[model samples]
Target: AVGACVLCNSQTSLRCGACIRRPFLCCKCCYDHVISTSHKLVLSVNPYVCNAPGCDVTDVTQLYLGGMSYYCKSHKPPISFPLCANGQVFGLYKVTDFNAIATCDWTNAGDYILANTCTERLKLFAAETLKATEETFKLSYGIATVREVLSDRELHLSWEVGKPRPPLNRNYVFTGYQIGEYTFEKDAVVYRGTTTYKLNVGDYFVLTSHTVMPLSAPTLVPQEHYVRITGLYPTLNISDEFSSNVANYQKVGMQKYSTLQGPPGTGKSHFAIGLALYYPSARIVYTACSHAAVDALCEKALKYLPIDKCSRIIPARARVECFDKFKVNSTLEQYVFCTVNALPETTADIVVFDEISMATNYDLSVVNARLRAKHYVYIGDPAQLPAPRTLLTKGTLEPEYFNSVCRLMKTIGPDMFLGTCRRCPAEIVDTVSALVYDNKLKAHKDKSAQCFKMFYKGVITHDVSSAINRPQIGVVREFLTRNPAWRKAVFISPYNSQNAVASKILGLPTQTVDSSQGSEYDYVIFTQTTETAHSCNVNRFNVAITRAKVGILCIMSDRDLYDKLQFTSLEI
Candidate 1:
């Protein structure tokens, strides 16, 4: 009634020797399948008997010691202990608590098992040997591959403040800092779950993406479309040729509705003049946010545009007159100067608006609705001072006009950017460009324009009055005497109150950064009168630092602001 052998249809009273793997086999089939391999045969407890001399047992307690050798418990041979691998022998005590056992090497996917766990000395030696072996392997195979091997073999020891605790039965993600709990292998290494283990300090880990702009260093210029702007008009002068970016922007102006965006000192005014000259027959309405800006644009236009074709529409209250036919001192007229409130009730072919950043949204909308021009060109830098008080209900809320133009132009899809700076000296140019585009203010050196810093001696109790440091004023006066072109220089202040005080102290006219937006000078002295935890206003600083064409000297009373520049503090 016995069952057939698992390998063939033969009666079987025996099975394979191994405990849990390949256990069922007949006596002849076991010998043939095992082929003299070293595996112990296991028999059933019931209907089993030992064949040792003068001994009869119902079942076997342990496997045979040697090939085809069987014995009862009382007649079994003594366990053979291994040699002292560490050379520390102690009588039979070496095998006192030791017994024959089997252990699988998990490091190599359980490739093999040791007959006994008495090879601690050999394991230590092997580990040391592996350390030196991996060093040479790294040189040839690269550190990454070598380390991967070490990790796979569980040979890399922990060196940081944690025990080896790799997650069990699951793959884990590790950053250089800590082991992330969740499985985020959508874009990472797939780690198989094992015993708890810790990662090395230098192990590479990725937690998030980085897209921050550098504070001091410039980032790569964005890849954008460049439109060629030169040679569209025959009368256009090429004395100081336009850069490719400027020419591209001018080319877009031909399409009628173009927005020219750039940082300070990027020649927005000159480009506007070029557009005016390009359309000789078209009646052009040129205007700006403030009268100062209007006057500067008028000067540039007169220099470039034909005296007969160009005109200035000024208020009747102002007693300015240049060309009677071109210049109309009327309160309301097209193709000439007119205030935002008194926009001319007429039509023109092209309308050029300068300092568009300073115009309020309401003012721009009014121009959009009332001015009937075939083409409109807006030029300004959003990095400069924005429009003041477009929103009045929230006493603290002021919307920028530049933001509105940017939003509209984005939808309209015709815009150009410029970066060439011509007003400031090389040193000032570098500093302002870093602040505006790179979000940093860097210190620089220049030979033509004197550049230096002066620190305050006494603590400032008041805001406006404390900015006038006499020692700094003495230094300023000496520089003025040496240059003698102080008439073309102006002292710039953070606030108008300080501007007035500094102007009175140095006997020179001073202007705040807001009023001096479109104006350039031979020399500029900036007075820092206020200090706060708030970072610098990039737009204000860009406009203030870019006004000087020759040199700049900063006289600062705020220690905090001076420290923020990351420059050496020098007393001149």
Candidate 2:
């Protein structure tokens, strides 16, 4: 475009507009010129007659692409030939192509009698060529008035009146095929395309077509259809600590249960998924404040009970009755997609709440009301990483104790407790466990020893922007990279941006940790801890800090906030 003609390319043998579409190839000048020329053509077509579909051909009509041009006399057949109801044979015609446009030629062979024409006269003679071509198109297809019209995607036909047409019967079909059109004259029931017959007790008709009947309803898997998972799904594999907590819930089977002790990265979702899978046949309704959390649990569940398992669960128990003419085959017997909004009101056998901290007091009340089931699971990490934005803050609530501040705080919400972590370095796990519960398998001494011993071998960073309060993340990253002898690392971030930033700066993406599911992460980084009040909120604060394994490094810059706190720390 810098040295080339912009409007229409004058460059090279293919003198056309420089390719303006791909920005990498064309310049602004080339783009502008090509656009300007196209606009001029558009302006010239105004106030022109359009002889195309859904158009009226007149001087005032606007002619555009997809419109038909008319020729009084031509041998070429029309793109669409009208079908006449009266008896007549249909025929074809010849067509000449023009820049994606087709023109009809009426004459079998065009011949001009005049000769020895002057220059101006020759121009006139050339113009007459168009007329000759137009004149010949009037020849018919050896058929009477067009009785049927056909286009690329559809067909139009006409038939006589008072004739019997094909019988019509509606039924479910999987696929359809075409053979011939039904003519009114062929059936006597049709009176001008309308049937007036009525008041008959018994009436019968038959219909014919190449369409195959499709299944009407999804097949349901029978009851007691057990799903034996050869491989463990993340939701199914409960960490020892988490398993103990869930088992407690199962043992209590309490009427009203909530994960109120704020602990982030706790297996709230894992507990839910495990509980759901543990109790098959019983409806399991799981919900989260964010669809991401819901999707996370669903994905974990799908790994073991892939879509192919649908046949194993449905039809053993049918929820719907059979249809007479229309039959639909069942694919999934039980529904997996339940609306979370309708959860509290739903009477499922088991219900789960992920990110319980996001729920309202009223929401919690409603959840309590709906907890009529013998079993349920509540998952939430209260450390408030990715804390609630609208809820009460310390400045607003102005309470005395952390717990008091949380309770009085208008934003105090539900939460899940993940006392045991499935994703963290063994050191991180022990360190955090010691900090929270004062119980360590051994002195984690150095980060390297902790890195090599976690249950999971790989490390992945999860992006958590909102959970930024914890400052020890640098310590966590330093520990993992320096102590790589024992741990193979992979970074996980909740967001690609954070992942890239952390990976660039720390040489590893911040590992993402989902409380409700499990993944292999020898050393996991929880990066969503924001320093906001809701974040410092007791429940939110506890959940986030508990995400790591043996060596927990809370990457928080605020030393004053935890100064009065009773927790002890072991510096590397």
Candidate 3:
């Protein structure tokens, strides 16, 4: 008699083949009852057989039935084993149970090998990769000893045990996978890879050439990060000469806080102009330490910036037609200049602190704290004179961060060493760069037919004072008699008090190194007195020599005193 079909409840001669736990079904019901393509049908009269499911091996003889379920030898999964190399522990799983392991002493084991503890293994790894190929692990040694080797599958392939050591301190790390060499030792496991050596000691492993971890290492100052900020502004469209270093400074200027540095005559003011032009929509608070310097900057700004966008902030007592003026108790406004003492809480988007090197630490800190801005571009020449230290008595006014702009430049590479000197004559540019910066700067052909000369007069006698040598005045008169342009020439002195002779020579006000920081002239007569030579300031001397655009004439009180300078006198 035909039995009832379990699924359809109909009498039938056909029966289900794939369903082993339930009753058989008729042909139509059996086909509809199966959910997977691996299910197979069979006649009820015959014994059950194997069916190839996920594997390619179809040999029916290799099948086995354990509790009415069919499985083949090919269906067996890999076995995983715990391993330790050096000071670390990890797991190694065998994908194939075939002939995977070979004895370490196969053929190359005859050579001597280098062995180390877990910590030593990490050090050796770092040392090997960082050195030349003569120090590689494969070239140096042959065998590695692993511990607790249970099955042949537990033994991993060759290990490049000489891996880099992790960083001493790190934080905030997350990783997915990594790849490289791994060694298993009696007490620990060590990983050797191209990854940073700053990872901490913990459970970490490489999977499919990726790292799976939870730490990160600090990186060098990235150019991409700087470029991204610069990229926000449209390329500068103003008509001016620019260098790679100048472009880099402008790029740096777009950051939250930046410093633009170079010797005199490298177009620092032009860079400041470009920075101002790059962000016209934002308000800019432009300032310098000196009133005359800020006035000069204001005049320069009027050449490009709209009259409304260009606002000069001056002391209420200062005589200047500023967009807004500020008293000691007054507040600041966006795009308006204010005195350092009168800085407000809500400042502009851009704060350009010019003559930064001349400002005291206390003065700078006050301005830095009060100026609420998105970007602060500190521009100065560290080669110039530092601010007087009269206010250093205040504990907070210590000169630590006063030179913060220069400090920032030191952290970066030689990009801050601006090589081009457009403002000075060729001879002066070469002389100052070599004397002060120790760099041989490149200059275009000499444009102004001019030369720098040094006069060595004997020791100043009672007939001539060291402050203003009588012989030097005759030399200055001869130079002016030939040049004949009073505005093209100015005398520079180390002391402001002894500049009367210089003022009388050029028929104009003489300049001290402090006042001549930004101003330049066609010809400069720099006086070096014997008294000043004993305590000579290199920065002051550099600023004195580098201000001449056409030529420079240095008047020394004595030849022996001039020889005591850092640079030997070169005949020009």
Candidate 4:
């Protein structure tokens, strides 16, 4: 039965290796035909014989992908997440007994297995506990990868935990304190079903159809329907100059893949919506790393898309409180959303990845693996914080991540940037622009008129150090209470617990700097103290300051600490 390929009709060829007919294919024919179909396993060859000596099982079909080069179907190596992995270690222990890592509930799709009560996520959280000796503080982070699936409850995991680089404690004014840390990173080895696992400028497979977007594996057939968006969204107000940015963004995005990057208030969301509307026939999907971001984009789409055409994605078991508001806008039967993980089986024409900053290179790989569309587009400021490094999914296609953005900057003229600020005033925009974006970001002259505050302009700093953060809260509350003009005023903080108290009192949209991304307000109340620079993180302060449309009120508990951040402004 060793004959010619079905298409090429040549003996010197390849076949799907998994089928009865096993389409014989030339290299070109294989890539095209294989890619054209939803064939999860590509044509890999070199014949089959039991690699295990003294055993001659020649069922070629047994060799599914890089299956045991020598062994037959029966095999060995690995037991459970708490047991398997070529050389992985047990990472955590619950507050009490048996030292967690249990269960095998076998939930969701076949890709998932049972939970050990202490699910993978909770296990990760437990591992990072800080224990201090008389002189040193130590903590560890864990990176877990799929080793093998033992059973419904005994899935194998390559969970390795150890030290990363080094933790910073030099700035700790308190004498004699050595802080040490440990951690590992995640990587995809080869195939999703087994083990193993984008982008310039930003999944495929369907019957009688093809479309996708990437860090790699660009679509041979890309979506190239060109459209002018300047005349559209008249009420949404696309600036005369910024429209050119949007037009170019669409021109490149529809045909190829590109990221629409810019500082806050640069209309990334508005631009994405414009492109979505332009391609009326394309099955557009808007998604981001967080539900909050996708929810925001979906709600924004409400202004333009017909009710039937737009929807939000939620897990089947989702009982999230935040989703209550989304339900208020649509019906249960009308809007039954599924997990983003369910996308591989579905078909899509175009995909828009909003809040692109929060996604790691690995996140992009997971989407592109199977869910590809003709046109791929993204919108977000890479400067607006990023996904944690530990979360960067590992594998061959990582591209080191910097290659895409760095290459785009070199070959292109920073076309990715939607530099003009259409929301913030000139003064506040300049403050943020100077602090982070190398002064390239600017306010649109005509479109950027003060929506409210014209007299009291620019960033305002309150110089005061108190025993507690009470004074800062009062500082924030009094400004809006007295004037009552700053109706859209809100509070943001780096600490989540800080938001809990602020949300209860401030009575405005209170969120952490992480949650505050892709959001804005009339005025932003940001409180900062002598918190460690590492905890403050890179440009989280930048994102905080940029959220304010008209002005900023920074209550600096220690002026010297906040001063080092270059948060200079008008005196209190």
lDDT of each: 0.48, 0.33, 0.47, 0.45
Q: C-alpha displacement of 458 in model 3, angstroms? A: 5.1
Rank by lDDT (best first)? 1, 3, 4, 2
User: Taking the tens digit of each residue's C-alpha lDDT, what string does model 2 give over 376-478?
Assistant: 4455432334322221222332111122112322244433334544444444445445443335223223343332211111223323222222233455566
Decide which is better by TM-score, 2 or 4.
4
* Candidate 2: worst-modelled 10 consecutive residues by lDDT: 93-102
Q: TM-score winner among the candidates?
A: 3
lDDT tens per residue, model 3, 452-513:
44544524333122244555666666666675663566778665434655565557557776
Which candidate do you rate higher for TM-score, 2 or 3?
Answer: 3
- Count clashing pairs, candidate 4: 33
Q: Quote the lDDT for 364 in model 3.
A: 53
lDDT value, residue 263 of candidate 2: 34
TM-score to true structure, per model: 0.50, 0.35, 0.51, 0.50
Q: Which parts of model 1 are misplaced by more than 4 Å?
A: 1-250, 253-256, 316-326, 330-335, 390-403, 406-414, 439-449, 455-458, 461-488, 533-535, 557-569
lDDT of 4 by residue, 339-363 (tens): 2343433445556766665654334
Candidate 1 at residue 343, lDDT? 64
Query: Which model is ahead, 1 or 4, in terms of lDDT?
Result: 1
- What are the per-model C-alpha RMSD values against the true structure? 30.4, 29.6, 27.9, 18.3
Better of 1 and 3 by TM-score: 3
Answer with 3 or 4, whichever has the higher lDDT. 3
